[PDB]
């Protein structure tokens, strides 16, 4: 299990985080979706980038709290990872950390924008899962 892709499974409705070619970020319940394979890479300890391998885009959060796919890994692409007691993780926008804006998905699969997210919500809980070698 060395350097293989990962999925991020959201507790809220069981959606996998999805980064679409047009830069849309949402969730899908379809675990065989073509746009859910991710590479999580660390910067400093507890800082991560989340890259959609099928498009080459990095997960980013804009100044309004909306998730989008960025072709370039810039300041808006860094997230602070925390490991909750329930074994799911949360991801906080580093650039907007003072606002406590999380990566989040609604039960309908759409992005729950930064200001609509809230600590303790199922919307913000993501479990990293493997993708098989082949």
Curated annotation (Swiss-Prot):
It comes from Rattus norvegicus (Rat). Plays an important role in the regulation of cell survival, cell division, angiogenesis, cell differentiation and cell migration. Functions as a potent mitogen in vitro. Acts as a ligand for FGFR1 and integrins. Binds to FGFR1 in the presence of heparin leading to FGFR1 dimerization and activation via sequential autophosphorylation on tyrosine residues which act as docking sites for interacting proteins, leading to the activation of several signaling cascades. Binds to integrin ITGAV:ITGB3. One of its GO terms (cellular component) is extracellular space. The keyword Acetylation applies. Keywords: Acetylation, Angiogenesis, Cytoplasm, Developmental protein, Differentiation, Growth factor, Heparin-binding, Mitogen, Nucleus, Phosphoprotein, Secreted. SMART domains: FGF. GO terms for molecular function: fibroblast growth factor receptor binding; growth factor activity; heparin binding; Hsp70 protein binding; integrin binding; S100 protein binding. InterPro entries: Fibroblast_GF_fam, IL1/FGF. It is found in: Secreted; Cytoplasm; Cytoplasm, Cell cortex; Cytoplasm, Cytosol. GO terms for biological process: activation of protein kinase B activity; angiogenesis; branch elongation involved in ureteric bud branching; cellular response to heat; epithelial cell proliferation; fibroblast growth factor receptor signaling pathway; lung development; mesonephric epithelium development. Monomer. Homodimer. Interacts with FGFR1, FGFR2, FGFR3 and FGFR4. Affinity between fibroblast growth factors (FGFs) and their receptors is increased by heparan sulfate glycosaminoglycans that function as coreceptors. Found in a complex with FGFBP1, FGF1 and FGF2. Interacts with FGFBP1. Part of a Cu(2+)-dependent multiprotein aggregate containing FGF1, S100A13 and SYT1. Interacts with SYT1. Interacts with S100A13. Interacts with LRRC59. Interacts with CSNKA, CSNKB and FIBP. While binding with LRRC59, CSNKA and FIBP seem mutually exclusive, CSNKB and FIBP may cooperatively interact with FGF1. Residues 106-122 are annotated as: Heparin-binding. Heparin binds at residue 12. It comes from the Eukaryota. This is Fibroblast growth factor 1. Belongs to the heparin-binding growth factors family. In the nucleus, phosphorylated by PKC/PRKCD. Gene3D superfamilies: 2.80.10.50.
